[PDB]
Ligand SMILES: Nc1[nH]c(=O)nc2c1ncn2[C@H]1C[C@H](O)[C@@H](COP(=O)(O)OP(=O)(O)OP(=O)(O)O)O1
Protein backbone atom coordinates (compact mmCIF):
# COMPACT_ATOMS: atom_id res chain seq x y z
CA UNK A 1 0.00 0.00 0.00
CA UNK A 2 1.00 3.60 -0.60
CA UNK A 3 0.92 6.78 1.41
CA UNK A 4 -1.16 9.72 0.16
CA UNK A 5 -0.76 13.48 0.48
CA UNK A 6 -3.82 15.74 0.72
CA UNK A 7 -4.50 18.39 -1.91
CA UNK A 8 -7.46 20.60 -2.80
CA UNK A 9 -8.90 21.70 -6.12
CA UNK A 10 -11.53 24.43 -6.47
CA UNK A 11 -13.67 25.07 -9.54
CA UNK A 12 -15.22 28.53 -9.65
CA UNK A 13 -18.28 27.46 -11.64
CA UNK A 14 -20.98 29.98 -12.54
CA UNK A 15 -24.11 29.37 -14.67
CA UNK A 16 -22.38 30.19 -17.99
CA UNK A 17 -18.65 30.24 -17.27
CA UNK A 18 -15.86 28.70 -15.24
CA UNK A 19 -12.69 30.35 -13.93
CA UNK A 20 -9.44 28.49 -14.55
CA UNK A 21 -5.80 29.34 -13.87
CA UNK A 22 -2.95 28.94 -16.33
CA UNK A 23 0.23 27.74 -14.67
CA UNK A 24 2.91 30.22 -15.68
CA UNK A 25 6.20 28.94 -14.27
CA UNK A 26 8.10 25.73 -13.60
CA UNK A 27 7.34 22.23 -14.78
CA UNK A 28 3.74 21.89 -15.96
CA UNK A 29 3.49 25.49 -17.16
CA UNK A 30 1.00 26.08 -19.97
CA UNK A 31 -1.90 24.03 -18.57
CA UNK A 32 -5.22 25.41 -17.26
CA UNK A 33 -6.33 24.09 -13.87
CA UNK A 34 -8.65 24.75 -10.98
CA UNK A 35 -7.13 26.45 -7.94
CA UNK A 36 -5.63 24.57 -5.04
CA UNK A 37 -2.65 23.07 -3.34
CA UNK A 38 -1.52 21.06 -0.38
CA UNK A 39 -3.61 20.89 2.80
CA UNK A 40 -1.70 22.13 5.84
CA UNK A 41 -1.53 20.77 9.35
CA UNK A 42 -4.51 21.52 11.57
CA UNK A 43 -6.88 22.97 8.95
CA UNK A 44 -9.92 21.17 7.64
CA UNK A 45 -9.82 20.17 3.99
CA UNK A 46 -12.55 22.71 3.14
CA UNK A 47 -10.69 25.49 4.94
CA UNK A 48 -7.50 24.51 3.13
CA UNK A 49 -9.38 24.74 -0.16
CA UNK A 50 -10.65 28.23 0.70
CA UNK A 51 -7.16 29.31 1.76
CA UNK A 52 -5.60 28.01 -1.45
CA UNK A 53 -8.26 29.70 -3.58
CA UNK A 54 -7.44 33.04 -1.93
CA UNK A 55 -3.67 32.63 -2.11
CA UNK A 56 -3.72 31.49 -5.72
CA UNK A 57 -6.51 33.58 -7.28
CA UNK A 58 -7.19 36.43 -4.85
CA UNK A 59 -10.83 35.34 -4.54
CA UNK A 60 -12.45 34.87 -1.19
CA UNK A 61 -15.52 32.78 -0.52
CA UNK A 62 -17.45 32.17 2.64
CA UNK A 63 -18.18 28.56 1.74
CA UNK A 64 -17.52 25.80 -0.73
CA UNK A 65 -19.36 22.63 -1.57
CA UNK A 66 -17.51 19.36 -1.97
CA UNK A 67 -18.18 17.67 -5.30
CA UNK A 68 -15.57 14.95 -5.69
CA UNK A 69 -12.40 13.16 -4.67
CA UNK A 70 -9.74 12.04 -7.15
CA UNK A 71 -6.61 10.02 -6.43
CA UNK A 72 -3.67 10.55 -8.79
CA UNK A 73 -0.80 8.13 -9.16
CA UNK A 74 2.29 8.96 -11.21
CA UNK A 75 4.73 6.39 -12.54
CA UNK A 76 7.93 6.69 -10.52
CA UNK A 77 6.30 8.54 -7.61
CA UNK A 78 5.38 6.30 -4.64
CA UNK A 79 3.20 8.95 -2.98
CA UNK A 80 -0.42 9.25 -4.13
CA UNK A 81 -2.11 12.62 -4.54
CA UNK A 82 -5.47 12.63 -2.79
CA UNK A 83 -7.33 15.57 -4.30
CA UNK A 84 -10.53 16.87 -2.73
CA UNK A 85 -12.59 18.79 -5.28
CA UNK A 86 -14.89 21.68 -4.42
CA UNK A 87 -17.19 24.09 -6.25
CA UNK A 88 -17.68 27.68 -5.06
CA UNK A 89 -21.05 28.76 -3.66
CA UNK A 90 -20.66 32.46 -4.50
CA UNK A 91 -17.55 34.56 -5.04
CA UNK A 92 -16.33 37.92 -3.81
CA UNK A 93 -13.80 40.05 -5.64
CA UNK A 94 -12.00 39.81 -8.96
CA UNK A 95 -9.34 37.20 -9.69
CA UNK A 96 -5.73 38.41 -9.80
CA UNK A 97 -2.77 37.34 -11.90
CA UNK A 98 0.36 36.32 -10.02
CA UNK A 99 3.84 35.44 -11.20
CA UNK A 100 2.79 31.77 -11.14
CA UNK A 101 -0.80 31.81 -12.37
CA UNK A 102 -3.01 33.73 -14.78
CA UNK A 103 -6.76 33.37 -14.12
CA UNK A 104 -9.20 33.47 -17.00
CA UNK A 105 -12.92 32.90 -17.49
CA UNK A 106 -14.13 30.38 -20.08
CA UNK A 107 -17.67 30.05 -21.34
CA UNK A 108 -19.14 26.59 -20.73
CA UNK A 109 -19.20 25.82 -24.48
CA UNK A 110 -15.46 26.66 -24.63
CA UNK A 111 -14.00 24.57 -21.84
CA UNK A 112 -10.31 24.27 -22.86
CA UNK A 113 -10.02 20.50 -22.36
CA UNK A 114 -7.05 20.06 -24.70
CA UNK A 115 -5.04 22.42 -22.48
CA UNK A 116 -6.22 20.94 -19.16
CA UNK A 117 -5.04 17.86 -17.33
CA UNK A 118 -6.32 14.87 -19.40
CA UNK A 119 -8.35 13.50 -16.47
CA UNK A 120 -10.50 16.65 -16.46
CA UNK A 121 -12.14 15.51 -19.70
CA UNK A 122 -13.66 12.63 -17.71
CA UNK A 123 -14.76 14.20 -14.43
CA UNK A 124 -15.54 17.79 -15.33
CA UNK A 125 -18.69 16.80 -17.32
CA UNK A 126 -20.08 15.28 -14.11
CA UNK A 127 -19.25 18.47 -12.24
CA UNK A 128 -21.13 20.46 -14.90
CA UNK A 129 -24.21 18.25 -14.36
CA UNK A 130 -24.05 18.94 -10.60
CA UNK A 131 -23.14 15.32 -9.90
CA UNK A 132 -20.63 14.04 -7.34
CA UNK A 133 -17.81 11.64 -8.13
CA UNK A 134 -14.88 9.52 -7.06
CA UNK A 135 -12.00 8.98 -9.45
CA UNK A 136 -8.55 7.50 -9.75
CA UNK A 137 -6.04 8.15 -12.55
CA UNK A 138 -2.58 6.68 -13.11
CA UNK A 139 -0.31 8.80 -15.30
CA UNK A 140 2.89 8.20 -17.19
CA UNK A 141 4.28 11.73 -17.13
CA UNK A 142 1.87 14.62 -17.66
CA UNK A 143 -0.07 13.47 -20.73
CA UNK A 144 -0.70 9.71 -20.69
CA UNK A 145 -3.30 7.88 -18.61
CA UNK A 146 -2.43 4.17 -18.13
CA UNK A 147 -5.39 3.23 -15.90
CA UNK A 148 -8.33 5.08 -14.42
CA UNK A 149 -11.65 4.65 -12.68
CA UNK A 150 -14.51 7.11 -12.43
CA UNK A 151 -17.78 6.63 -10.56
CA UNK A 152 -20.70 8.91 -9.81
CA UNK A 153 -21.52 8.81 -6.09
CA UNK A 154 -24.33 10.15 -3.94
CA UNK A 155 -22.01 11.18 -1.09
CA UNK A 156 -18.41 12.27 -1.59
N1 LIG B 1 -4.19 15.35 -12.83
C1 LIG B 1 -4.66 16.51 -12.29
N2 LIG B 1 -5.85 17.01 -12.66
C2 LIG B 1 -6.34 18.18 -12.16
O1 LIG B 1 -7.41 18.63 -12.60
N3 LIG B 1 -5.67 18.87 -11.21
C3 LIG B 1 -4.50 18.35 -10.78
C4 LIG B 1 -3.95 17.19 -11.31
N4 LIG B 1 -2.78 16.94 -10.67
C5 LIG B 1 -2.61 17.95 -9.78
N5 LIG B 1 -3.66 18.79 -9.86
C6 LIG B 1 -3.88 19.99 -9.02
C7 LIG B 1 -4.17 19.58 -7.56
C8 LIG B 1 -3.68 20.80 -6.80
O2 LIG B 1 -4.68 21.82 -6.87
C9 LIG B 1 -2.48 21.23 -7.61
C10 LIG B 1 -1.20 20.60 -7.12
O3 LIG B 1 -0.84 21.26 -5.91
P1 LIG B 1 0.60 21.93 -5.73
O4 LIG B 1 1.62 20.83 -5.66
O5 LIG B 1 0.76 23.04 -6.72
O6 LIG B 1 0.38 22.49 -4.24
P2 LIG B 1 1.15 23.63 -3.40
O7 LIG B 1 1.16 24.88 -4.21
O8 LIG B 1 0.54 23.65 -2.02
O9 LIG B 1 2.63 22.96 -3.35
P3 LIG B 1 4.06 23.57 -2.89
O10 LIG B 1 4.84 23.62 -4.19
O11 LIG B 1 4.58 22.53 -1.94
O12 LIG B 1 3.75 24.92 -2.28
O13 LIG B 1 -2.71 20.77 -8.94
Ligand code: NA
Nearest residue numbers: 036037038052
Ligand atom coordinates in the same frame (compact mmCIF):
# COMPACT_ATOMS: atom_id res chain seq x y z
NA1 NA C 1 0.20 25.54 -0.56
Ligand code: NA
Nearest residue numbers: 035036037056
Ligand atom coordinates in the same frame (compact mmCIF):
# COMPACT_ATOMS: atom_id res chain seq x y z
NA1 NA D 1 -1.01 25.38 -6.45
